[PDB]
Short mmCIF file of N, CA and C in Angstrom, two decimals:
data_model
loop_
_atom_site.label_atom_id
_atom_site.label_comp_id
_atom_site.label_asym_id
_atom_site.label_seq_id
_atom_site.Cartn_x
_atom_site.Cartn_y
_atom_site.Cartn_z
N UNK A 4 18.80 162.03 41.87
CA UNK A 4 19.50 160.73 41.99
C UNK A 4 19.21 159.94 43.27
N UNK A 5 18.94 160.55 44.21
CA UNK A 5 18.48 159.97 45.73
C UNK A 5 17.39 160.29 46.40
N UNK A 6 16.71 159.40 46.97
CA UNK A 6 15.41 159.74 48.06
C UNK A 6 16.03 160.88 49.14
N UNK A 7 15.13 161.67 49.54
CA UNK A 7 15.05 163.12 49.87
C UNK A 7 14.81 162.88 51.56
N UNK A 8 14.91 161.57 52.32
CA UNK A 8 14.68 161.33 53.66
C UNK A 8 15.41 162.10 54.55
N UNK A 9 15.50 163.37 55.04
CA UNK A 9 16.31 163.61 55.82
C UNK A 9 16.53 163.12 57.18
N UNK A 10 17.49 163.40 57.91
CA UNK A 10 17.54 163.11 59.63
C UNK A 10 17.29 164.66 60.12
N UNK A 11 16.27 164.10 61.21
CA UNK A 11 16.52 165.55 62.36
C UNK A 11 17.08 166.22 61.85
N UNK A 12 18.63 166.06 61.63
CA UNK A 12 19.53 167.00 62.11
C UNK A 12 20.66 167.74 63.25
N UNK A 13 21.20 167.37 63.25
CA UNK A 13 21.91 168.39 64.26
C UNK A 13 22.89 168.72 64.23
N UNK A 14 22.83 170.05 63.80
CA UNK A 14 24.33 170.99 63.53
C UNK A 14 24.77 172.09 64.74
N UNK A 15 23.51 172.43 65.81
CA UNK A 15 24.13 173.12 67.25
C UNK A 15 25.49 172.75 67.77
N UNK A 16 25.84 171.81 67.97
CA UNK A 16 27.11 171.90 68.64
C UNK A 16 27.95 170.00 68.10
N UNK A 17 29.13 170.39 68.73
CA UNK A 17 29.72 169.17 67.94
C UNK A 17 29.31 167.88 68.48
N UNK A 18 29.73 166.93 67.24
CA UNK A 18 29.03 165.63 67.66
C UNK A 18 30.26 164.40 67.55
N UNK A 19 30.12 163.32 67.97
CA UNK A 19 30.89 162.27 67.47
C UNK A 19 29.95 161.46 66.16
N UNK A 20 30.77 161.20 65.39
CA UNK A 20 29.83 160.02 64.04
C UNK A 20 30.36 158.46 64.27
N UNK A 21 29.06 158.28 65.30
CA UNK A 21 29.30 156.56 65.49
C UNK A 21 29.37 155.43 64.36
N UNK A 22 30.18 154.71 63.79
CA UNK A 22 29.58 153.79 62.93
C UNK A 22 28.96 152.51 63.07
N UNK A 23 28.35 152.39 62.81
CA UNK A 23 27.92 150.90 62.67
C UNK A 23 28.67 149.07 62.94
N UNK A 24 28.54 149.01 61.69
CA UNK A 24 29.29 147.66 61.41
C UNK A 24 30.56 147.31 62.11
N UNK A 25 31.19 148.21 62.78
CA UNK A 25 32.60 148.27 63.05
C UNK A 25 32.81 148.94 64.67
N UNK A 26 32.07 150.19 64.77
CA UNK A 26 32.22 150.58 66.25
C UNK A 26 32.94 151.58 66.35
N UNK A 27 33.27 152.79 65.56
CA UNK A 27 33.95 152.90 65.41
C UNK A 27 33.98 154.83 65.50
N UNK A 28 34.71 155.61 65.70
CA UNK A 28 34.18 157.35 65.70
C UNK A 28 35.34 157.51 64.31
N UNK A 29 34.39 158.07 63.59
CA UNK A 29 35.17 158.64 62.20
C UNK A 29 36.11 159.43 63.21
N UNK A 30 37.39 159.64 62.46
CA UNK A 30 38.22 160.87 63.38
C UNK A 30 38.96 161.00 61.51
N UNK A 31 39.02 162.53 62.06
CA UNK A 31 40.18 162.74 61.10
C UNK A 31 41.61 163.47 61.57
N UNK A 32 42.37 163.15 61.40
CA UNK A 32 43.83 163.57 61.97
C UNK A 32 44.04 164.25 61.55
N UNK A 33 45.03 164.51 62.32
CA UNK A 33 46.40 166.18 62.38
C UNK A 33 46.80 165.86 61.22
N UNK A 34 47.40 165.20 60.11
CA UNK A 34 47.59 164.82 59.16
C UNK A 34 47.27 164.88 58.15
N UNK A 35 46.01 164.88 58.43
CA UNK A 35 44.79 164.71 57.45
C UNK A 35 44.59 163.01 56.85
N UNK A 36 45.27 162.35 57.70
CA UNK A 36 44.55 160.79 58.07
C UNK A 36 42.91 160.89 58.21
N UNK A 37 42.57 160.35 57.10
CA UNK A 37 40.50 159.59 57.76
C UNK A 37 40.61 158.24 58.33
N UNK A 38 39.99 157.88 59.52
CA UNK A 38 40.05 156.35 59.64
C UNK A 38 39.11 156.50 61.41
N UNK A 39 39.25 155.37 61.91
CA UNK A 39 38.01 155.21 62.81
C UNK A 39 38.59 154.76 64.38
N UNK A 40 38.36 155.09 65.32
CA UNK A 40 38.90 155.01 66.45
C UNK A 40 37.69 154.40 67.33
N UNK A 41 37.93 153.62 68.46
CA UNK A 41 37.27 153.07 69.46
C UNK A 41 37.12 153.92 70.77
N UNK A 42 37.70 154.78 70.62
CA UNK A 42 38.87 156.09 71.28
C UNK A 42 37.36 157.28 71.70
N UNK A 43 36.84 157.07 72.57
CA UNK A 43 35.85 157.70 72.83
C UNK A 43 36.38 159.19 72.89
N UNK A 44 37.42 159.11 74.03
CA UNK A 44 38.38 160.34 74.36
C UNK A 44 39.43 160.92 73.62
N UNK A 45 39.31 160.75 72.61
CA UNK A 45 39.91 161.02 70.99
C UNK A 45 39.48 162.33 70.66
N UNK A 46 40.11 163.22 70.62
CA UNK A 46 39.93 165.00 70.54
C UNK A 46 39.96 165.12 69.00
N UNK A 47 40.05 164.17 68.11
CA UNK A 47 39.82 163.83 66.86
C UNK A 47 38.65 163.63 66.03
N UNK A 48 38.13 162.90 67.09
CA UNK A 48 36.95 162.37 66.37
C UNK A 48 35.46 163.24 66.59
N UNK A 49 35.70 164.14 67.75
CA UNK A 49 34.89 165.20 67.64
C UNK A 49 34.20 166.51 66.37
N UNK A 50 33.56 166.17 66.08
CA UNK A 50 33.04 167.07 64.37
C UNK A 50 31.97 167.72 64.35
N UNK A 51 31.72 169.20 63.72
CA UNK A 51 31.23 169.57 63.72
C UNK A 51 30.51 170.16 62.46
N UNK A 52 29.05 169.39 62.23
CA UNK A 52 28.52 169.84 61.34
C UNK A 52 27.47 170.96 60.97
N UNK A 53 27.70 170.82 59.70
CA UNK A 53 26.44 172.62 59.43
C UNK A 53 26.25 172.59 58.04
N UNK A 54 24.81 172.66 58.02
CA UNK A 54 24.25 172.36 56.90
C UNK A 54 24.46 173.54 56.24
N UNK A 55 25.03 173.40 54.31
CA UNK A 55 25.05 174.24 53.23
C UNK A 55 23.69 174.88 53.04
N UNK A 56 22.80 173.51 52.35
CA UNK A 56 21.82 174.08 52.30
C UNK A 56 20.66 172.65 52.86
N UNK A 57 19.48 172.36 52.61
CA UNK A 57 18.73 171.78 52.88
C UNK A 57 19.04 170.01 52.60
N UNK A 58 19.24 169.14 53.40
CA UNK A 58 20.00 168.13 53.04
C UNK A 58 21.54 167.79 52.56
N UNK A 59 21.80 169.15 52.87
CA UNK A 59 23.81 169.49 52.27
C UNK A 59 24.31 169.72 53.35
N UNK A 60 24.98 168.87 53.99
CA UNK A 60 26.65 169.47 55.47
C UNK A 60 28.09 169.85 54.63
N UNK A 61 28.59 170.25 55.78
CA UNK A 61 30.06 169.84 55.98
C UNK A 61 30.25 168.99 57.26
N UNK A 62 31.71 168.80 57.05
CA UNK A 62 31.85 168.14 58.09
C UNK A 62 33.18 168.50 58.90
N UNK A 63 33.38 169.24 59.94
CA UNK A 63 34.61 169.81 60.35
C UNK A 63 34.80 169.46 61.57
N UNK A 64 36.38 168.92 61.59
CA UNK A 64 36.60 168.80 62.98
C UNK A 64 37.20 170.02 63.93
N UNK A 65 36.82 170.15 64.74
CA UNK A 65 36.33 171.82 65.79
C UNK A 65 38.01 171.24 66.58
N UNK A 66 38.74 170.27 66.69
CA UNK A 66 40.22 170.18 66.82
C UNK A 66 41.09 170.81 66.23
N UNK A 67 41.33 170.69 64.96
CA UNK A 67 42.36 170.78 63.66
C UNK A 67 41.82 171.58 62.53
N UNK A 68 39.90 172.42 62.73
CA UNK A 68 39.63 172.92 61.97
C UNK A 68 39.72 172.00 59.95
N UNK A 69 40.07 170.99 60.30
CA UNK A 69 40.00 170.26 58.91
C UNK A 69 38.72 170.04 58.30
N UNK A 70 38.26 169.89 56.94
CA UNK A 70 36.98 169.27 56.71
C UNK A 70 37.56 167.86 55.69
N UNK A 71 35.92 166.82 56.06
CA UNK A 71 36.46 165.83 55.19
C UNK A 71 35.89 165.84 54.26
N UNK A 72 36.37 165.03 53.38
CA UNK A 72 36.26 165.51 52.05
C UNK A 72 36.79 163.84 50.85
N UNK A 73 36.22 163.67 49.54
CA UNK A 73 36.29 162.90 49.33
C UNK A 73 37.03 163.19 47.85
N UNK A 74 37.92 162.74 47.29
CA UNK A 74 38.97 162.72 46.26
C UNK A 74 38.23 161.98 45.09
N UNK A 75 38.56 162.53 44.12
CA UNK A 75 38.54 161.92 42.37
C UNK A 75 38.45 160.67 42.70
N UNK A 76 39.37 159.93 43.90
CA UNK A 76 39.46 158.40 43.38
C UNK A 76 38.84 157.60 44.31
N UNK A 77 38.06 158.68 45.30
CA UNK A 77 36.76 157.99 46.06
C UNK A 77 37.92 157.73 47.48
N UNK A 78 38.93 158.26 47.57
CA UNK A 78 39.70 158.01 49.23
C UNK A 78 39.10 159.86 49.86
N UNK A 79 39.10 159.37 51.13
CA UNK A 79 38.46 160.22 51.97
C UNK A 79 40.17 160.76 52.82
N UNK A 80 39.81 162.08 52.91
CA UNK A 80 40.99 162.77 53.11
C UNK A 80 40.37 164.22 54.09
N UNK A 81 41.97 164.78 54.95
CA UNK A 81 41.02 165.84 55.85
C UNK A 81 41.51 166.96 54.84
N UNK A 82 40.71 167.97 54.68
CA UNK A 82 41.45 169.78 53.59
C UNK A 82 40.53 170.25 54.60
N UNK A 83 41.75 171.17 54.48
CA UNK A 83 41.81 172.81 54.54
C UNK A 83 41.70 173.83 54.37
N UNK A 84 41.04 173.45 52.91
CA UNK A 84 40.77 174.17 51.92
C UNK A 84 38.88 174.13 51.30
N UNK A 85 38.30 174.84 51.50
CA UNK A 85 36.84 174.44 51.43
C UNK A 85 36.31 174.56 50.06
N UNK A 86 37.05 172.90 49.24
CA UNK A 86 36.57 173.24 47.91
C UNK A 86 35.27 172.74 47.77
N UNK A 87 35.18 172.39 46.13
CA UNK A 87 33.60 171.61 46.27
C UNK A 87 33.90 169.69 46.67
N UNK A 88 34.88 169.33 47.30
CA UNK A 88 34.80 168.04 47.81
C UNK A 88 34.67 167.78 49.23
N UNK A 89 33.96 168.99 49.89
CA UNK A 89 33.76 168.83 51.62
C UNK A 89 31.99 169.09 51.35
N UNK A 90 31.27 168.58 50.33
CA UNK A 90 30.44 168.67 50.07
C UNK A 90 29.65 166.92 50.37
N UNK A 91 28.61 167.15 51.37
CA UNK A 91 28.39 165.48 51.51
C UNK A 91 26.82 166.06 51.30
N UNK A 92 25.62 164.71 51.08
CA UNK A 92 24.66 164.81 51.02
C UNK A 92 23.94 164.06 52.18
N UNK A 93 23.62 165.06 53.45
CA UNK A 93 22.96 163.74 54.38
C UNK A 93 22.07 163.36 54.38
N UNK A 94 21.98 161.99 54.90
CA UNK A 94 20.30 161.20 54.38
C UNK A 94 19.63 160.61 55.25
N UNK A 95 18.95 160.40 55.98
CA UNK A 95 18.75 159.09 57.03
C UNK A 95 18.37 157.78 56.20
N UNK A 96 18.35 156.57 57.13
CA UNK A 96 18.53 155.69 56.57
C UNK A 96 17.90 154.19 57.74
N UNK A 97 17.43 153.52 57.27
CA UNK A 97 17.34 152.51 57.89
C UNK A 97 16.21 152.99 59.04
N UNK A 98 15.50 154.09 58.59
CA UNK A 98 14.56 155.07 59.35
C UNK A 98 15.58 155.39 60.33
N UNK A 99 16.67 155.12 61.02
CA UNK A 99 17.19 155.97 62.07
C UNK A 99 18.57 156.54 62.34
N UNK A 100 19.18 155.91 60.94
CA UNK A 100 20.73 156.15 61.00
C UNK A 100 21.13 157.50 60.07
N UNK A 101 22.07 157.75 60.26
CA UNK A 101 22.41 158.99 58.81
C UNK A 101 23.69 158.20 58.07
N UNK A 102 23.52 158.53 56.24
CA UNK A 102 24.36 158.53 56.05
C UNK A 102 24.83 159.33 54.85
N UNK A 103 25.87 159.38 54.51
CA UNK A 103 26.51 160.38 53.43
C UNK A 103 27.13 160.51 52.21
N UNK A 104 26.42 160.68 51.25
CA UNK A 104 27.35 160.63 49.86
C UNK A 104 27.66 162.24 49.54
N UNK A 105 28.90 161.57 49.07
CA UNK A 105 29.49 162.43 48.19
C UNK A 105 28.94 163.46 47.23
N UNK A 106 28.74 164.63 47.17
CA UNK A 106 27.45 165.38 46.87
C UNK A 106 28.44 165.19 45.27
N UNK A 107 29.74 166.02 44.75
CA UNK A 107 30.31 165.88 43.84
C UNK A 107 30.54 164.37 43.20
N UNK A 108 30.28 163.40 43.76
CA UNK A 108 30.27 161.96 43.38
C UNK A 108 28.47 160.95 43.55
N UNK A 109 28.03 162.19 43.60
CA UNK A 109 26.60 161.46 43.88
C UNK A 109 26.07 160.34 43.04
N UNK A 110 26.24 160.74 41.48
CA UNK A 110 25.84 159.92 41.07
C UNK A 110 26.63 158.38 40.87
N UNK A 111 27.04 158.47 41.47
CA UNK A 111 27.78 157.26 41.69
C UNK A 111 27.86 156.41 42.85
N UNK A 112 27.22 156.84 43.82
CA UNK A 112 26.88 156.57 45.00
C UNK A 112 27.96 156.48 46.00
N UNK A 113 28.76 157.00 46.03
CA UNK A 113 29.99 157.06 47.13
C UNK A 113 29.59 157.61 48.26
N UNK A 114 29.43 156.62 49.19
CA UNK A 114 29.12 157.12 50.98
C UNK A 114 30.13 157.43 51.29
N UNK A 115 30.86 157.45 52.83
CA UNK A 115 31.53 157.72 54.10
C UNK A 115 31.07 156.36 54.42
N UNK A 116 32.33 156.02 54.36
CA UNK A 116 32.13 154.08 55.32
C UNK A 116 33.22 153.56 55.86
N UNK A 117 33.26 152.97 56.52
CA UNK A 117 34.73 152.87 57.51
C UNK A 117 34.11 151.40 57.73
N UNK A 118 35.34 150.23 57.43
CA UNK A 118 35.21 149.19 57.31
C UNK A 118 35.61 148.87 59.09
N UNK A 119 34.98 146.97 59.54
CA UNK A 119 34.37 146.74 60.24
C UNK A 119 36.54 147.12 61.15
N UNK A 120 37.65 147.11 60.30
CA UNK A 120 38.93 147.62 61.03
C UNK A 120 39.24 148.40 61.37
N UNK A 121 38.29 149.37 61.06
CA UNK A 121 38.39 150.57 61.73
C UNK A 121 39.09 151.44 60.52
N UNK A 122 39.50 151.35 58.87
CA UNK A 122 39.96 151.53 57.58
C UNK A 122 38.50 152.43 57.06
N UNK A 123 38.58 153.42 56.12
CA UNK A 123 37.57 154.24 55.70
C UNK A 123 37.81 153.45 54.65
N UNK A 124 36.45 152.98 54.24
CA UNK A 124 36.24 152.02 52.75
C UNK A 124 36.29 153.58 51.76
N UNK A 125 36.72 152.72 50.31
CA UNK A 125 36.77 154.15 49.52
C UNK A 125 35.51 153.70 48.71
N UNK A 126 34.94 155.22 47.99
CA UNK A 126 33.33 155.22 47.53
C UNK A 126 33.20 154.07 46.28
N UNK A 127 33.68 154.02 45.55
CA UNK A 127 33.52 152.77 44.65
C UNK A 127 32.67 151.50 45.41
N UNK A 128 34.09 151.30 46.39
CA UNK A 128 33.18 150.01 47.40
C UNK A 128 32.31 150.17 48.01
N UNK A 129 32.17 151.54 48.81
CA UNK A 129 30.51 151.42 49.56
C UNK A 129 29.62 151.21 48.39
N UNK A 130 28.23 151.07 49.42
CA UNK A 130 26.88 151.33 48.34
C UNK A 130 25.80 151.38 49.44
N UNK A 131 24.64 151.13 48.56
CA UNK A 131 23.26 151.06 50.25
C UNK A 131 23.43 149.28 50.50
N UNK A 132 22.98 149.18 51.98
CA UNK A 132 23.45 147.98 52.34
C UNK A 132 24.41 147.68 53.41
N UNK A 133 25.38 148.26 53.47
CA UNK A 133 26.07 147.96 54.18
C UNK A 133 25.88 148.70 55.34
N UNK A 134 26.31 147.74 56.18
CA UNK A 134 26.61 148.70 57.44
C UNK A 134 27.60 149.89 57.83
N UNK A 135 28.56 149.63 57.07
CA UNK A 135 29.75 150.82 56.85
C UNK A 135 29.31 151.99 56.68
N UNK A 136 28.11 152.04 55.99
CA UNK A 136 27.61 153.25 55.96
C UNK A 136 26.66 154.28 56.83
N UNK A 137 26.28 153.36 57.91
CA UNK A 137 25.46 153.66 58.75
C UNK A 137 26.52 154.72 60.08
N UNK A 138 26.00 155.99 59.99
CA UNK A 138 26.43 156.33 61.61
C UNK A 138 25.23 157.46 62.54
N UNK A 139 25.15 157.06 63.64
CA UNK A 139 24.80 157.84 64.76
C UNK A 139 25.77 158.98 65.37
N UNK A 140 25.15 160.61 65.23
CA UNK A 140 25.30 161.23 66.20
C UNK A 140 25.37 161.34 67.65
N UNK A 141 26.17 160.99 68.18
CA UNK A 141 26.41 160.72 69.71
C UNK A 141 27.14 162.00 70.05
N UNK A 142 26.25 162.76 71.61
CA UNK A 142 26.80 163.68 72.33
C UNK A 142 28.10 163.62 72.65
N UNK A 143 29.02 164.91 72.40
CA UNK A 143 30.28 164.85 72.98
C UNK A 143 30.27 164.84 74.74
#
């Protein structure tokens, strides 16, 4: 269903996921709130990924131990539980950005996108194109 471009990579140690369009560090909360902070110093937004298998992560925050994960109805949510919806497909993009669909929603194209308010767009609305979808690994 998708071009096979991977990024580098980097699953050694935790990272922040910069976004794009908006500015924004995915964080996922104590709560299990998804949404996007400006909050450099945000003990939230710190995540740590590790590839399943070849082009397959998770995505866990090394805070709250949560992974994110994307729901039947395309809203992005933190579990606890490591079913098959903490399953993302990473891709690079734009030759330098990464971004992520929904490995269980693939064919449908549902990224990780966090609108320019700092709000996680749900997968229906993303697509390729937008900037919402674009994020950089930045050193903690």
């Amino acid at each position: 269903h998708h071009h096979f471009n991977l990024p580098p990579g980097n699953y050694k140690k935790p990272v922040l996921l910069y976004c794009s369009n908006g500015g924004h560090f995915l964080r996922i909360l104590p709560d299990g709130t998804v949404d996007g902070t400006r909050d450099r110093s945000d003990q939230h937004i710190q995540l740590q990924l590790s590839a399943e298998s070849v082009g397959e992560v998770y995505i866990k925050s090394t805070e709250t131990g949560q992974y994110l994960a994307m729901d039947t109805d395309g809203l992005l949510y933190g579990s606890q539980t490591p079913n098959e919806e903490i399953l993302f497909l990473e891709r690079l993009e734009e030759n330098h950005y990464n971004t992520y669909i929904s490995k269980k929603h693939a064919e449908k194209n549902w990224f990780v996108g966090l609108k320019k308010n700092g709000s996680v767009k749900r997968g229906p609305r993303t697509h390729y194109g937008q900037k919402a979808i674009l994020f950089l690994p930045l050193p903690v």
